Amino acid sequence: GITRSGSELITTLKKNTDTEPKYTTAVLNPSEPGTFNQLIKEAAQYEKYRFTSLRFRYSPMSPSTTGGKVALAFDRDAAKPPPNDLASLYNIEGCVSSVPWTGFILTVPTDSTDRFVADGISDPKLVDFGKLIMATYGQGAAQLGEVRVEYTVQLKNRTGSTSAQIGDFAGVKDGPRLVSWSKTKGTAGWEHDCHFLGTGNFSLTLFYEKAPVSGLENADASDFSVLGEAAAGSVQWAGVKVAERGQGVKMVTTEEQPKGKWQALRI
Amino acid sequence: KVTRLSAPVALAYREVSTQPRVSTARDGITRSGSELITTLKKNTDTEPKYTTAVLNPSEPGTFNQLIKEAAQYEKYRFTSLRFRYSPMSPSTTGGKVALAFDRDAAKPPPNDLASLYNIEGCVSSVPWTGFILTVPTDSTDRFVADGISDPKLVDFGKLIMATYGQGAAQLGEVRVEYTVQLKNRTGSTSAQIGDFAGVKDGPRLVSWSKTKGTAGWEHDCHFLGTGNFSLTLFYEKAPVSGLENADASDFSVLGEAAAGSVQWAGVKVAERGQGVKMVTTEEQPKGKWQALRI
Amino acid sequence: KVTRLSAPVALAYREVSTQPRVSTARDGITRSGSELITTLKKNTDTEPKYTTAVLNPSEPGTFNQLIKEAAQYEKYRFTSLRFRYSPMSPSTTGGKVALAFDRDAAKPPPNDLASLYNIEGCVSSVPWTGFILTVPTDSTDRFVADGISDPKLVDFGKLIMATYGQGAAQLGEVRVEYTVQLKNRTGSTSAQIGDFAGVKDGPRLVSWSKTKGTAGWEHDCHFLGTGNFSLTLFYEKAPVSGLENADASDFSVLGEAAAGSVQWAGVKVAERGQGVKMVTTEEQPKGKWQALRI
Amino acid sequence: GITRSGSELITTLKKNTDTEPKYTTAVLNPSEPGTFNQLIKEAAQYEKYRFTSLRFRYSPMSPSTTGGKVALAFDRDAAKPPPNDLASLYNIEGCVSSVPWTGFILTVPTDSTDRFVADGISDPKLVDFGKLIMATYGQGAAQLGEVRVEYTVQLKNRTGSTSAQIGDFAGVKDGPRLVSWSKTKGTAGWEHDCHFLGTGNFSLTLFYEKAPVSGLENADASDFSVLGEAAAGSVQWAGVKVAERGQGVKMVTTEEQPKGKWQALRI
Amino acid sequence: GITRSGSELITTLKKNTDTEPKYTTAVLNPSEPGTFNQLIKEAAQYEKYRFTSLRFRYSPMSPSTTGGKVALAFDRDAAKPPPNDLASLYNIEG
User: Fold this and answer.
1) DSSP 8-state code for residue B62
2) Which residues contact residue E12 at a Cβ distance below 8 angstroms, ignoring those fewer than 6 apart?
3) How deeply is D218 buried, as exposed, middle or buried, from its count of CB atoms within 10 A (0-12, 13-18, 19+)?
């Protein structure tokens, strides 16, 4: 084995001037960028880990003239519906929400079993502890604060590999059959779907034939870079910068599914 | 007290996650609190406004984690139980957050304060601070509700909480510090199944409600027990209505009407015997139902 | 921690006026901090915004009282150095005031927080409180910049500071708690004089910048060292322009153009090698200049 | 520090049915793939080393009905012209050539100074011992044999980083400005160049506009996968499987450099 | 527990007068005859094992007037596609 130590800043939160919290539950595993954009680059050479240190601080950068709460407590079982309701939240360890005008920390009893990261899929339970959570309920106005993850990991067994990703459609069917980060659904009335399952800035590159409707548009997205035609048989490219998990981008070509091909590298 | 005081802009607390503790045979088991009973919500108005919540080993609207170990017993205790206004909202907000229990856990809250401010409990404070509440608990082997009954011989009394203010916020939260005694070994429950057979009915497997009808068919769908429930049930000629309610707590119907369908609701009662009803003709035969407590 | 907290309306501190202290020959001198490195200014916005300031015995934009005793030495230490957010602005204001150093005192701040909130330093807090910051200092005989160089082999790394908020105020101020080691006895400096002779030039008296040109006359006016400087200089056919800048820190030009004039500027650099330039024809002869560090 | 042990097979040799040897001199440094394709993957986290064990064997896999010699001796000063002539070779330790129908070994007196690998450039002398050599002079016919490098290394100081990827050409110039593995040169008479600086199986994906000449052809290459047009404005893809460092692939489009864009992910 | 010792002769190989290897990957487990025709008869009375000794020899019964290579190296993870290519092979212990 090798090791590490934290320094990440896992997404924020945003007002809530409402009477029911509202959660951003973020998942924890050596490779889940939506929780590690700087360490998901050294787990492409190993498989298994540790944790020995990891805590989340509500940095505190917003005056007191604002208030409410900012729940923040982890639940091993990093996967299952957040509740819907507080008490529900306020009953699951973690413990610790405080107001937004102060500086709090959060800590987690970490174990000691040689768990494996996801070069997929699996089951969200045998591969990673559990997701994190964060709610905040208030009404007085502000852009609360930010947090990270204080940690120290153990990456046993020397491996090495990974990426995102080339995924072609075959007139009858498709083809994602070589590491993901996006799911490509379509919404009928052809207008389509071009998605994510992972989080970070990417380098798209791809797909083609009948350069129709459009292409490479985007919606719940981060920066876009398209240097293509349209193509009616062309080539294309873009750089995303996402937001929280699952942000989407899309084309526009007819009616019913066959096309060409693509490849999505993470970067 | 004297001189110096710091009413901070902000004050706040940090509560955790109560993990539970328990005893031999002697003729009983036990417990300890950790629940968080609903909140409150502003009140930027000049008259309080109450959420009165009922107390009994099985009334989820006051225990979502202990109403799962009273399906094997019947009778209890209390030895410890207090409610804290956790305090998670700055001082730039204010008013009051009344909070005092009344044995007689069932009867109209008043309408007015003084009325409230005259019934022990005592203790409201402002929303920017952390307060606690405590209750003189007795010592009689009382029974939980595998129904219905009477809201008085089966459970101490409901709790209350008001808050009157106008400066803006989502005040705080509370729970129930407790330690119970669950004698007599029993075991059973859920949401009770009771079918009507065209000639007659059928409640013949543990209660909490009595189903009377008032002629001019408009009907009756009742309780003998007290707490939050999970209804689930009954059907055939989906008539008139169904699942309406009157002296009731929250209702949840996710059915048709049905003229042959299926249905569901969650109650949150008030004091003993609150009622809900259908509407289907004239003279009694129907279908079936099952009422689990929860 | 627990219970009670007073986030006062106002909190404030009272700092004085550090008078300095010093050692034999052995092969060195020493120091101790007391500087107040620029502030910050609101940010009533949702993305921080940084003033990253560079650290080296001579970089005034980080030492206006000690960059006067490194004109006689070359190499140092650090044994003590921390930055405090003095705290002089009521709580009726809020947000954050990031503040953490990164050895590698040169490289783009990010653009984004997490990015910031992932680089040690650690420590931002709200603006209505008094915080401190500290840095694990090493132990290698590093050299100051009588120029230019490379921003990495000559100085640890720049400091940073962000603050993101919206409630209104002129937050606070900070300095640098330190104690230095200035080995090797040298002595010299100012703002370096380097003239071009129609056939050739002339840098022949201590550096910090290299003056290249890129054909298509548009030119080059550079650095090999890092800190805030006082330019002063050069002249004759006041052409194109002059004293423009690109990968630069603050610029101060109080000249003509000149077609025979005089000029001046103050830089505040970034990491090593940032550039500034004139504009005059085609092929190299001119006049003269002198670049003092400060 | 960490450590290692050999198992590599450094290129062969090929007849020589001629009267003057002929050398393949191969350079030695923890990271020089042309001498380590399986260990140049764990020096992107350190900087400095050892050697404690390292020898080259002429495996012997070719009958005696063939003959000559297979010189094979290392020279610390791993960089300088091989000679031109034998005696020259037969005067520089190493020692040990034998015939091709036998099994020989080679060994090297290894030192003991904390030397640094090349995250570049430098000087070929202060960063690595010296290159290896191998000649063989014969005329009787065969594909002699193969060798490797018996070793055990020491990788001090914990570091971590490296590589050789999206790289666009801007009509005036290009753009590789985000991690390498290939250098794109062209040979005039437009016929072009599409290269490597790294080694492994890859997932290409990319570039486009005037779909000319060709595209994605290959030459000193491993498996190719092109699922593009040509494109005259299209899109493309391929999977390489290289050989030793620097194998090349190319397009064909005119005369003088501007085009479109590309991205090369390692995989 | 009981024990054993080898002596099996696991299939051969056959020319390859070609420029890309070609593999016969054979699986290892006390009962997988395609790797044990004499010991898969005494594991019908137990369940679990060991290994303490096991090596494969290329007996050598063919003159030198013939040549090439005969790769031969095991990979714990006794199941997954052989590659397609050498280097691929020539990178996996054995």
Assistant:
1) T
2) none
3) middle
Measured in angstroms, the CA of E67 and the nearest CA of chain D are apart by 6
**Angle at alpha carbon of residue D108, lines to D104 and D114, rounded to 5°:** 150
Chain D residue closest to E93 (CA)? D7
- Inform me whether the C-beta atom of residue A66 falls under 8 Å from chain C C-beta atoms: yes
Q: Is B288 left (phi over 0), alpha (psi -120 to 50) or beta?
A: beta
Most B CBs within 10 A among A15, A17, A90, A137, hence the mutation to make, goes to A90
Give SS3 for D204: strand
Token duo for residue C24:
């034999």
Element (H, E) at E87: helix E86-89
Resolution (A): 17.0
Report the CATH number of the C189-294 domain. Answer: 2.60.40.3420
Between CA C201 and CA C209 the distance in angstroms is: 14
Distance from C-alpha of E34 to C-alpha of E19, rounded to nearest angstrom: 27
For chain E, counts of helices (H) and of strands (E): 1, 0
Residue with tokens 């791809």: A206
Tokens of B171: 């005040």
The secondary structure of residue A23, as a DSSP letter, is B
> Which residues lie closer than 8 Å to B210 by C-beta, 6 or more apart?
B148, B203, B220, B222, B223, B224
In contact, D43 and D31? CB cutoff 8 Å: yes
Residue reference for tokens 């402002």: B126
B189 DSSP 8-state letter: -
Lookup result for tokens 């699996």: A122
Number of separate helices (H) and strands (E) present in chain B? 1, 5
Q: C116: helix, coil or strand?
A: helix
How many Cβ atoms are within 10 Å of E92's Cβ, its own excluded?
15
What does the domain layout of chain D look like in residue ranges? Answer: 1-161, 162-267
Q: CA-CA distance, C99 to A61, in Å (whole number)?
A: 12
Residue E14 has which token pair? Answer: 């056959």
| β-strand partners of D158 | D46
Report which of B89, B177, B82, B174 is spatially closest to residue B126, judged by C-alpha positions. Answer: B89
Helix (H) / strand (E) element for C264: namely strand C264-265
CATH class of D1-161: mainly beta
- What b-and-e string marks burial along A71-82, b requiring 16 or more CB atoms within 10 Å of the CB? bbbbbeebeeeb
Give all chains having 3 or more CB-to-CB distances under 8 Å with chain E.
D
- Classified as helix, coil or strand, E86 is helix
- Beta-carbon neighbour count of residue C270 at 10 Å? 21
Distances (CA, A) of B234 to B197, B212, B237, B243, B262: 12, 15, 10, 11, 7
Contact B88 A69 (CB under 8 A): yes
Interface touch B14/A104, C-beta < 8 Å: yes
The CATH architecture one would assign to domain C1-188 is Sandwich (2.60)
Interface residue E64 vs chain D (CB under 8 A): yes
* CATH code matching the domain that covers A162-267, chosen among 2.60.40.3420, 3.55.50.30, 3.40.1410.10, 1.10.10.10: 2.60.40.3420
Q: Which residues contact A84 (CB under 8 A, 6 or more apart)?
A: A20
- CA–CA dist A237, D167 (Å, integer): 11
B51 by Cβ neighbours in 10 Å (0-12 / 13-18 / 19+) ranks as middle
Alpha helices, DSSP H, located in chain C:
113-116
Instruction: Count the Cβ atoms, other than its own, within 10 Å of residue C185.
Output: 12
Give the pair of three-digit tokens for residue A60: 């505190």
Q: What CA–CA distance (Å, rounded) separates D96 from D28?
A: 18
For residues A43 and A119, give the distance between their C-alpha atoms in angstroms, rounded to a whole number.
Answer: 10
CB contact at 8 A, C35 and C176: yes
D166 touches chain E (CB under 8 A): no
User: How many Å apart are CA D131 and CA D78, to the nearest integer?
Assistant: 3
